[model samples]
Target: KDPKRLYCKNGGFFLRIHPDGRVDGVREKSDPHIKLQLQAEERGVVSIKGVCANRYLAMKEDGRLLASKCVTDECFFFERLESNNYNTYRSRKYTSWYVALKRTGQYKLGSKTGPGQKAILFLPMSAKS
Candidate 1:
């Protein structure tokens, strides 16, 4: 897919990254930051770049998500399909950290999440309606 949306399991939010490099979860599908380009790098590895912001989704070791201009190892995610038919994106640079959304429409710190947590699960869907 050219562009995709990440439907977060918690709070029914969509993943969004601001042009200012902030990451959050939005309730609206119309938000421009909801559009993401996922490039598969290798087996189960991918890089998520924001289409509207023109930035890469990178996870810091402290669990903060950043929209970076450079494609670094922090931008790489190890995508794993869970048993519940949802997906989890673990930081390739920090193996235990995951891309997660908080119930408050904010992003959960990756270090605060686990693979079994609902906040860490997401459904990848086409951005185009």
Candidate 2:
């Protein structure tokens, strides 16, 4: 049996969230956004991999796990907990995890795109043990 899968040219990026719930400031092409969350106490490690807009993977922490997928038009979310051996537990857990907005008002500039033109916010995991 092989311990690792074959390498691919266009594979997705991997992101690691620490225990303080803060972004590691390490960004890659696959995952451009910084991870701004920490791993749960009960969780040993969590891995997330996918493309910029189309991907699928599992996020585990604090004895719980969550699976997410983004298709051409819709994004789905699911949860798994230790109580049920990490089985699928929820159908609709979150609406949207990330959001982007253009900053204006006092922070807006005539030529610039504003102070928060490319700001991003990370959503906390909605799973429980």
Candidate 3:
């Protein structure tokens, strides 16, 4: 049997952007044996949050979800429906770095249809106090 793929349970380390758009995350030590080095900052210091899985998708800073096609020239399309309804289709070819802007209308999700048609939903950030 194949080993199970590991996923980060307790939220993984991320570069948190403050209300003012300041970013912060830990940096690893250049040395081979030692693991990481904390980054010092005036506003936000880098810290270790948790481990991340090898095959996980991260939602971008902006409100856009990203999808890519491994094949040479395939293209895919996704439609976002009302009340969380949607449909997905793929082209006979492949393309990479394809992006889906918003979850408000009928749109292409991605290309390279097979099992690679994974989509990430981007939720808007809550109002900061």
Best by lDDT: 1
lDDT of model number 2: 0.24
Residues 9-43, candidate 1, lDDT per residue (tens digit)? 99899999889899999989989889999999889
Candidate 1 vs. true structure, TM-score: 0.95
Residue pairs in steric clash, candidate 2?
18-38, 18-39, 21-37, 21-38, 23-35, 23-36
Q: Sort the predicted structures by TM-score, highest score first.
A: 1, 2, 3
Question: Number of clashes in every candidate structure?
Answer: 0, 6, 12
Please report, as a residue range, the 10-residue window in candidate 3 with the lowest summed lDDT: 1-10
Error of 3 at 75 (Å): 21
Compared with the true structure, the alpha-carbon lDDT of candidate 3 equals 0.22
> What is the TM-score of each predicted model, taking all chains together?
0.95, 0.18, 0.17
What lDDT score belongs to each candidate, Candidate 1 first? 0.91, 0.24, 0.22
Over 13-129, each residue of candidate 2 has an lDDT whose tens digit, in order, gives: 123223333222222422333222221222332223232322333322221222244221112233223332322212122222211112221111113221222322122322222
Candidate 1 C-alpha error for residue 39, in Å: 0.5
**Model 2: per-residue Cα lDDT at residue 25:** 24
Root-mean-square deviation (CA) per prediction: 1.3, 16.3, 17.3
Clashing residue pairs for model 1: none
